[PDB]
Amino acid sequence: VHGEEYAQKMQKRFHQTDIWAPFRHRYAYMYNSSNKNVKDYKQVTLSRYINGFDKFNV
Amino acid sequence: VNTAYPTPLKTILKTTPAFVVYFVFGLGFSTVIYDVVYHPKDRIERFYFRSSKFERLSRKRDEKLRHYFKPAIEWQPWYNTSTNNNTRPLLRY
Ligand SMILES: CCCCCCCCCCCCCCCCCC(=O)OC[C@H](COP(=O)([O-])OCC(O)COP(=O)([O-])OC[C@@H](COC(=O)CCCCCCCCCCCCCCCCC)OC(=O)CCCCCCCCCCCCCCCCC)OC(=O)CCCCCCCCCCCCCCCCC
Ligand SMILES: CCCCCCCCCCCCCCCCCC(=O)OC[C@H](COP(=O)([O-])OCC[N+](C)(C)C)OC(=O)CCCCCCCCCCCCCCCCC
Can you say whether residue A7 is alpha, beta or left, with left for phi > 0 and alpha for psi between -120 and 50 degrees? Predict the structure, then answer.
């Protein structure tokens, strides 16, 4: 709406594009930079005692 | 023909009922823990940290896809709740 040039300038982040640097608010550290609980807090609490939360990835 | 127990064994056997009761209670406790941790998963799932990096990624790929990828790709401006009670970021900052 403000302008195609304005949008292009806003989107551009690096002068040299040969390097990929994804934007991240923070970098994972625990569990070798991974997430053990990919769930909500409620799900994490309940799934340890209630069936149906696990989807049996087989 | 007095086929009685040896003296040391007979002396030892006095405390055996306590051992039997202890085994009963311990087996009950262990089985309760096993069932509680088995029913939700239908198995004794290995600890997440007891796995390789690739194994962890493979295990959590499906959960990530089901919980974040699909809402992220099906997102609409009016799907988010006005109360700001949205799902927390995967890596909370
Ligand atoms: C009088 C008037 C009448 C009054 C009426 C009152 C009201 C009546 C009820 C009304 C409502 C009925 C509704 C029915 C329909 C809805 C049902 C529903 O929603 O459920 C479906 C819901 C989901 O459905 P589903 O997926 O199809 O279920 C299939 C299975 O889940 C699939 O199983 P799985 O393949 O996944 O395998 C795991 C499963 C399999 O696990 C098992 O449950 C199997 C058995 C495990 C080992 C049990 C050992 C017990 C003894 C240990 C040693 C104790 C010593 C010390 C005490 C002294 C004992 C003399 O385990 C679990 O799921 C985890 C549950 C863990 C249970 C906790 C331990 C139970 C014992 C509690 C002991 C308490 C302390 C001692 C008290 C001492 C008192 C003197 O199923 C369940 O979650 C089932 C839960 C069952 C819990 C255990 C039930 C007892 C089992 C028999 C043992 C009884 C012992 C009593 C001792 C008494 C001594 C004096
Ligand atoms: C003087 C009195 C002495 C009393 C001694 C009693 C000692 C304490 C005993 C505690 C253990 C009792 C276990 C009984 C079986 C419980 C089964 C159960 O909850 O099912 C799990 C199952 C788990 O199944 P699930 O995990 O598949 O549930 C999810 C199901 N989907 C996926 C469909 C959503 O839960 C349910 O059935 C769901 C409804 C639960 C409703 C609430 C149950 C509360 C039970 C309280 C029992 C209190 C007994 C008090 C007796 C007093 C006598 C005077």
Answer: alpha
> Which chain B residue's Cα is nearest to A30?
B49
Final resolution, Å: 2.9
Atom nearest to A52 CA in ligand 2:
32
A41 neighbourhood in chain B, CB within 8 Å = 88
* Deposited experimental method: cryo-EM
User: What residues in B contact A54, CB-CB < 8 Å?
Assistant: 40-42, 45
**Calpha distance B3→A42 (Å, rounded):** 65
Indicate left, alpha or beta for A29 from its phi (over 0: left) and psi (-120 to 50: alpha): alpha
What is the dihedral angle through the alpha carbons of B62, B68, B74, B78, rounded to the nearest 10 degrees?
A: 150
Closest by CA position to B65, among listed B57, B53, B54, B77: B57
